[PDB]
Amino acid sequence: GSVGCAECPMHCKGKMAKPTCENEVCKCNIGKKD
Prior knowledge:
By secondary structure, the protein is α+β, with helices and mostly antiparallel strands. The chain has one helix spanning 4-10; strands at 19-22, 25-28. It has one domain. Helix content is 21%, strand content 24%. A hairpin with a 2-residue loop joins strand 1 and strand 2. Belongs to the short scorpion toxin superfamily. Potassium channel inhibitor family. Alpha-KTx 09 subfamily. Blocker of human voltage-gated potassium channel Kv1.1/KCNA1.
């Protein structure tokens, strides 16, 4: 259950916000919008 992808976006900084999930791992990076 990818939860990080929930906090990931939440833990994203203004001007750059995009949830990115990979095999249960999440990050806030442009190019992917999960």
